[PDB]
Amino acid sequence: MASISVQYRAGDGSMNSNQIRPQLQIKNNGNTTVDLKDVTARYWYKAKNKGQNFDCDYAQIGCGNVTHKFVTLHKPKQGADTYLELGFKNGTLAPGASTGNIQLRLHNDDWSNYAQSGDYSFFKSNTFKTTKKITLYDQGKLIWGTEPN
C-alpha cells in the first residue's frame, strides 16, 4: 500500500447552503520525511460558479505559495461538475510539520447555490478512512482518485 495516511470528516449527506468547510487529517505514516512542496489535491462539487475563495482555519504544514485550482466541466458524472481545490508548494525543509492535520474554510460563490445532500447521499463519505480519499497528485504524478466506499 501507499506510505501516506489520510482521514476525512465533514458530513454523511448534509446540504451546503454555500457555507461549507470539510476537514481532513493528512499524515505520512509510511514515511519519516515528506514535503508538501509538490502535492496538489482535487475535489469535486455540483455547481456552476467556480467557487469564491477559502479561509485558513487550522493547519500545521508550514506555509508557502499554495495555489488554488478551479475548473468546471459539463459532465455531471455522479453529482459534481465543478472541481475546486488547492496545491501546496511548500510546508517545511525538514521532518516535523509534515505530519499533522488540515482544516480550512470553504466559502462558495453565491451565484449557483446547491446542496451536497444529493451527491453525498449516494456516496456516504466522511465515515470511513482509506488511503484513497480523493483525486490528488504528489511528487509529480497521480496516486489517489477515489472516495472511501
PDB file of N, CA and C in Angstrom, residues 101-146:
ATOM      1  N   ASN A 101      -2.518  17.676  10.670  1.00  0.00           N
ATOM      2  CA  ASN A 101      -3.906  17.746  10.234  1.00  0.00           C
ATOM      3  C   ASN A 101      -4.135  19.017   9.428  1.00  0.00           C
ATOM      4  N   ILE A 102      -5.204  19.043   8.641  1.00  0.00           N
ATOM      5  CA  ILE A 102      -5.527  20.212   7.840  1.00  0.00           C
ATOM      6  C   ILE A 102      -7.014  20.540   7.956  1.00  0.00           C
ATOM      7  N   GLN A 103      -7.303  21.786   8.269  1.00  0.00           N
ATOM      8  CA  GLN A 103      -8.671  22.249   8.413  1.00  0.00           C
ATOM      9  C   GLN A 103      -8.776  23.685   7.924  1.00  0.00           C
ATOM     10  N   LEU A 104      -9.705  23.934   7.018  1.00  0.00           N
ATOM     11  CA  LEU A 104      -9.878  25.264   6.463  1.00  0.00           C
ATOM     12  C   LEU A 104     -11.343  25.558   6.174  1.00  0.00           C
ATOM     13  N   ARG A 105     -11.611  26.796   5.796  1.00  0.00           N
ATOM     14  CA  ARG A 105     -12.959  27.234   5.481  1.00  0.00           C
ATOM     15  C   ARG A 105     -13.167  27.229   3.980  1.00  0.00           C
ATOM     16  N   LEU A 106     -14.368  26.878   3.550  1.00  0.00           N
ATOM     17  CA  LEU A 106     -14.671  26.811   2.132  1.00  0.00           C
ATOM     18  C   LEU A 106     -15.907  27.640   1.792  1.00  0.00           C
ATOM     19  N   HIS A 107     -15.696  28.881   1.376  1.00  0.00           N
ATOM     20  CA  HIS A 107     -16.809  29.748   1.022  1.00  0.00           C
ATOM     21  C   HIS A 107     -17.022  29.753  -0.486  1.00  0.00           C
ATOM     22  N   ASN A 108     -18.202  29.327  -0.901  1.00  0.00           N
ATOM     23  CA  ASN A 108     -18.544  29.269  -2.314  1.00  0.00           C
ATOM     24  C   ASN A 108     -19.092  30.602  -2.780  1.00  0.00           C
ATOM     25  N   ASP A 109     -19.261  30.737  -4.081  1.00  0.00           N
ATOM     26  CA  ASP A 109     -19.789  31.965  -4.652  1.00  0.00           C
ATOM     27  C   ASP A 109     -21.299  31.881  -4.730  1.00  0.00           C
ATOM     28  N   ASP A 110     -21.971  32.910  -4.239  1.00  0.00           N
ATOM     29  CA  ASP A 110     -23.425  32.941  -4.242  1.00  0.00           C
ATOM     30  C   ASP A 110     -23.958  33.313  -5.625  1.00  0.00           C
ATOM     31  N   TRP A 111     -23.723  32.418  -6.571  1.00  0.00           N
ATOM     32  CA  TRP A 111     -24.170  32.578  -7.944  1.00  0.00           C
ATOM     33  C   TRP A 111     -25.044  31.385  -8.308  1.00  0.00           C
ATOM     34  N   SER A 112     -24.639  30.229  -7.800  1.00  0.00           N
ATOM     35  CA  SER A 112     -25.348  28.979  -8.010  1.00  0.00           C
ATOM     36  C   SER A 112     -25.237  28.148  -6.740  1.00  0.00           C
ATOM     37  N   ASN A 113     -26.242  28.251  -5.893  1.00  0.00           N
ATOM     38  CA  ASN A 113     -26.243  27.538  -4.628  1.00  0.00           C
ATOM     39  C   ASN A 113     -26.835  26.150  -4.787  1.00  0.00           C
ATOM     40  N   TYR A 114     -26.084  25.163  -4.340  1.00  0.00           N
ATOM     41  CA  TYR A 114     -26.507  23.779  -4.418  1.00  0.00           C
ATOM     42  C   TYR A 114     -26.217  23.087  -3.103  1.00  0.00           C
ATOM     43  N   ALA A 115     -26.818  21.933  -2.910  1.00  0.00           N
ATOM     44  CA  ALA A 115     -26.607  21.164  -1.710  1.00  0.00           C
ATOM     45  C   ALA A 115     -25.902  19.866  -2.046  1.00  0.00           C
ATOM     46  N   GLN A 116     -25.049  19.404  -1.144  1.00  0.00           N
ATOM     47  CA  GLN A 116     -24.323  18.163  -1.368  1.00  0.00           C
ATOM     48  C   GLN A 116     -25.089  16.989  -0.781  1.00  0.00           C
ATOM     49  N   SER A 117     -26.358  17.216  -0.486  1.00  0.00           N
ATOM     50  CA  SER A 117     -27.198  16.180   0.083  1.00  0.00           C
ATOM     51  C   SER A 117     -27.716  15.256  -1.014  1.00  0.00           C
ATOM     52  N   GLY A 118     -27.315  15.540  -2.242  1.00  0.00           N
ATOM     53  CA  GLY A 118     -27.715  14.722  -3.364  1.00  0.00           C
ATOM     54  C   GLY A 118     -26.601  13.794  -3.781  1.00  0.00           C
ATOM     55  N   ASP A 119     -25.406  14.351  -3.897  1.00  0.00           N
ATOM     56  CA  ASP A 119     -24.233  13.592  -4.292  1.00  0.00           C
ATOM     57  C   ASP A 119     -23.673  12.798  -3.116  1.00  0.00           C
ATOM     58  N   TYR A 120     -23.636  13.403  -1.927  1.00  0.00           N
ATOM     59  CA  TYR A 120     -23.109  12.713  -0.754  1.00  0.00           C
ATOM     60  C   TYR A 120     -24.070  11.615  -0.312  1.00  0.00           C
ATOM     61  N   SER A 121     -25.330  11.753  -0.708  1.00  0.00           N
ATOM     62  CA  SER A 121     -26.360  10.785  -0.362  1.00  0.00           C
ATOM     63  C   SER A 121     -26.073   9.435  -1.022  1.00  0.00           C
ATOM     64  N   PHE A 122     -25.441   9.477  -2.187  1.00  0.00           N
ATOM     65  CA  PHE A 122     -25.102   8.262  -2.916  1.00  0.00           C
ATOM     66  C   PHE A 122     -23.654   7.863  -2.655  1.00  0.00           C
ATOM     67  N   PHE A 123     -22.943   8.695  -1.914  1.00  0.00           N
ATOM     68  CA  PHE A 123     -21.552   8.442  -1.613  1.00  0.00           C
ATOM     69  C   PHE A 123     -21.355   7.933  -0.186  1.00  0.00           C
ATOM     70  N   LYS A 124     -21.995   8.600   0.779  1.00  0.00           N
ATOM     71  CA  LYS A 124     -21.884   8.237   2.193  1.00  0.00           C
ATOM     72  C   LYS A 124     -20.427   8.337   2.645  1.00  0.00           C
ATOM     73  N   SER A 125     -19.820   9.486   2.384  1.00  0.00           N
ATOM     74  CA  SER A 125     -18.433   9.716   2.747  1.00  0.00           C
ATOM     75  C   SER A 125     -18.347  10.309   4.153  1.00  0.00           C
ATOM     76  N   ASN A 126     -17.130  10.672   4.566  1.00  0.00           N
ATOM     77  CA  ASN A 126     -16.884  11.255   5.890  1.00  0.00           C
ATOM     78  C   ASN A 126     -17.291  10.292   6.992  1.00  0.00           C
ATOM     79  N   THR A 127     -17.041   9.020   6.751  1.00  0.00           N
ATOM     80  CA  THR A 127     -17.377   7.986   7.707  1.00  0.00           C
ATOM     81  C   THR A 127     -16.355   6.845   7.682  1.00  0.00           C
ATOM     82  N   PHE A 128     -15.517   6.817   6.653  1.00  0.00           N
ATOM     83  CA  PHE A 128     -14.504   5.781   6.518  1.00  0.00           C
ATOM     84  C   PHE A 128     -13.135   6.404   6.286  1.00  0.00           C
ATOM     85  N   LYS A 129     -12.088   5.647   6.583  1.00  0.00           N
ATOM     86  CA  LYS A 129     -10.730   6.124   6.392  1.00  0.00           C
ATOM     87  C   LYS A 129      -9.940   5.160   5.516  1.00  0.00           C
ATOM     88  N   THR A 130      -9.680   5.580   4.296  1.00  0.00           N
ATOM     89  CA  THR A 130      -8.923   4.783   3.353  1.00  0.00           C
ATOM     90  C   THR A 130      -7.763   5.596   2.816  1.00  0.00           C
ATOM     91  N   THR A 131      -6.761   4.920   2.279  1.00  0.00           N
ATOM     92  CA  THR A 131      -5.618   5.601   1.704  1.00  0.00           C
ATOM     93  C   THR A 131      -6.083   6.488   0.559  1.00  0.00           C
ATOM     94  N   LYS A 132      -7.050   5.984  -0.177  1.00  0.00           N
ATOM     95  CA  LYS A 132      -7.614   6.703  -1.293  1.00  0.00           C
ATOM     96  C   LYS A 132      -8.868   7.441  -0.834  1.00  0.00           C
ATOM     97  N   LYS A 133      -8.776   8.760  -0.750  1.00  0.00           N
ATOM     98  CA  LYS A 133      -9.907   9.577  -0.320  1.00  0.00           C
ATOM     99  C   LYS A 133     -10.444  10.432  -1.469  1.00  0.00           C
ATOM    100  N   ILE A 134      -9.547  10.908  -2.315  1.00  0.00           N
ATOM    101  CA  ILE A 134      -9.917  11.759  -3.446  1.00  0.00           C
ATOM    102  C   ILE A 134      -8.851  11.682  -4.517  1.00  0.00           C
ATOM    103  N   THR A 135      -8.998  12.486  -5.554  1.00  0.00           N
ATOM    104  CA  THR A 135      -8.023  12.526  -6.626  1.00  0.00           C
ATOM    105  C   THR A 135      -6.959  13.556  -6.277  1.00  0.00           C
ATOM    106  N   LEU A 136      -5.720  13.118  -6.173  1.00  0.00           N
ATOM    107  CA  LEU A 136      -4.637  14.011  -5.819  1.00  0.00           C
ATOM    108  C   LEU A 136      -3.336  13.562  -6.479  1.00  0.00           C
ATOM    109  N   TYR A 137      -2.413  14.496  -6.648  1.00  0.00           N
ATOM    110  CA  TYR A 137      -1.121  14.199  -7.244  1.00  0.00           C
ATOM    111  C   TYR A 137      -0.010  14.586  -6.278  1.00  0.00           C
ATOM    112  N   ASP A 138       1.050  13.790  -6.263  1.00  0.00           N
ATOM    113  CA  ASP A 138       2.184  14.048  -5.392  1.00  0.00           C
ATOM    114  C   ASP A 138       3.482  13.666  -6.086  1.00  0.00           C
ATOM    115  N   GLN A 139       4.569  14.350  -5.734  1.00  0.00           N
ATOM    116  CA  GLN A 139       5.905  14.072  -6.281  1.00  0.00           C
ATOM    117  C   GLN A 139       5.980  14.174  -7.807  1.00  0.00           C
ATOM    118  N   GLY A 140       4.903  14.606  -8.445  1.00  0.00           N
ATOM    119  CA  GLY A 140       4.913  14.728  -9.887  1.00  0.00           C
ATOM    120  C   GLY A 140       4.087  13.680 -10.611  1.00  0.00           C
ATOM    121  N   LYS A 141       3.172  13.022  -9.911  1.00  0.00           N
ATOM    122  CA  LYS A 141       2.336  12.002 -10.541  1.00  0.00           C
ATOM    123  C   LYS A 141       1.052  11.777  -9.745  1.00  0.00           C
ATOM    124  N   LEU A 142       0.087  11.119 -10.366  1.00  0.00           N
ATOM    125  CA  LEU A 142      -1.186  10.825  -9.726  1.00  0.00           C
ATOM    126  C   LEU A 142      -1.081   9.535  -8.924  1.00  0.00           C
ATOM    127  N   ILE A 143      -1.732   9.496  -7.773  1.00  0.00           N
ATOM    128  CA  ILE A 143      -1.687   8.314  -6.928  1.00  0.00           C
ATOM    129  C   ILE A 143      -3.067   7.967  -6.366  1.00  0.00           C
ATOM    130  N   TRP A 144      -3.818   8.975  -5.949  1.00  0.00           N
ATOM    131  CA  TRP A 144      -5.139   8.738  -5.392  1.00  0.00           C
ATOM    132  C   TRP A 144      -6.223   9.273  -6.314  1.00  0.00           C
ATOM    133  N   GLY A 145      -7.396   8.652  -6.263  1.00  0.00           N
ATOM    134  CA  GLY A 145      -8.508   9.081  -7.090  1.00  0.00           C
ATOM    135  C   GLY A 145      -9.741   8.241  -6.873  1.00  0.00           C
ATOM    136  N   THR A 146     -10.284   8.306  -5.662  1.00  0.00           N
ATOM    137  CA  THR A 146     -11.469   7.544  -5.308  1.00  0.00           C
ATOM    138  C   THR A 146     -11.873   7.828  -3.857  1.00  0.00           C
TER     139      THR A 146
END
